[PDB]
Amino acid sequence: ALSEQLAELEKRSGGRLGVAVLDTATGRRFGYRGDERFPMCSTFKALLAAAVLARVDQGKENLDRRITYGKEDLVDYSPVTEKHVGDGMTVAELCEAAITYSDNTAANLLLEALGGPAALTAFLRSIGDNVTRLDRWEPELNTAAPGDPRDTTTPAAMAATLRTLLLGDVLSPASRQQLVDWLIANKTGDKRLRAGLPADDRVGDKTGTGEHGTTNDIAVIWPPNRAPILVAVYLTESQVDADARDAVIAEVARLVVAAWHHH
């Protein structure tokens, strides 16, 4: 079954593969290494944007507030923020850049607006995630050293937290739709989960990439007129090249779609 298929795929990747599925139609779930820690890399940015939106809902933050910065603030891999040193960007624009491009400077600027990694972790604890932890800033949080619990989640905790944030009562309706809209507009995921999902599904996702052959993708999937399915995939310590790691994630999606009918 799916678990044996994922084990075969995992062996071919040379690394460690974690998968969680949470179907909101029924609450049906699946885990493969669902309670093992994996480096989040940029997947944390979905949670970061949620924490920012929570502050907006509380009147402590404004999506239209403009944040200025210089080249002195630019992290490697900042494809949006590097274009806006002159004029800065709004909190909303930074959230969009962090989610849809994995923009590292946007993420650091939002972390600063929140109070840093400890503040994000405290937000997660406050909504019932006792597992996920952010400890470092960009780019160090992508080090992905084996055995290091810093900056990690588990597939099951991430899927449960996504459910709470996108579909629960933590965020206002407008904030929930805004977070969904950003995920649906993601630009970094075309070779990962999306490449293995049916064309008529609407998909929002957030990728992560790091050292030690780390390639991740977390998604909210709406098949036609159906309640959504959450899928969280983490791959680390992989020994195949970048394109092959993407193909592992795409194949997880294909296997999940093909096996999800099983009760």
Residue numbers in the entry: 28 to 58, 60 to 238, 240 to 252, 254 to 293
Paper text:
Here, we explore and test these notions using resurrected Precambrian β-lactamases11 as scaffolds for the engineering of completely new active sites. A hydrophobic-to-ionizable amino acid replacement generates a buried (or partially buried) residue with the perturbed properties that are useful in catalysis and conformational flexibility assists the generation of a completely new active site by facilitating substrate and transition-state binding. We have shown that, when using resurrected Precambrian β-lactamases as scaffolds for protein engineering, a minimalist design approach based on this mechanism leads to levels of catalysis for the Kemp elimination reaction of up to approximately seven orders of magnitude above the rate of the uncatalysed reaction, as well as to significant ester hydrolysis activity.
Finally, catalysis of Kemp elimination is enhanced by an additional F290W amino replacement in the neighbourhood of position 229, which likely stabilizes the transition state through a face-to-edge interaction with the new tryptophan residue. Furthermore, the double W229/F290W variant of the GNCA4 scaffold is the most active Kemp eliminase reported in this work with a rate enhancement of about seven orders of magnitude over the rate of the uncatalysed reaction. Regarding the turnover numbers, the kcat values obtained for the W229D/F290W variants of the ancestral β-lactamase scaffolds are up to approximately seven orders of magnitude above the rate of the uncatalysed reaction. Unlike previous rationally designed Kemp eliminases, our best eliminase displays a maximum catalytic efficiency (∼5, 500 M−1 s−1) that exceeds the acetate in acetonitrile level. We therefore determined the Michaelis–Menten parameters for the degradation of a penicillin antibiotic (benzylpenicillin) and one third-generation antibiotic (cefotaxime) catalysed by GNCA4-W229D/F290W. We found levels of catalysis for antibiotic degradation similar to those previously reported for the GNCAMP β-lactamase. Furthermore, the turnover number at the new active site, kcat=7.6 × 10−3±2 × 10−4 s−1, indicates a three orders of magnitude enhancement over the rate of the non-enzymatic reaction (kuncat=2.5 × 10−6 s−1).
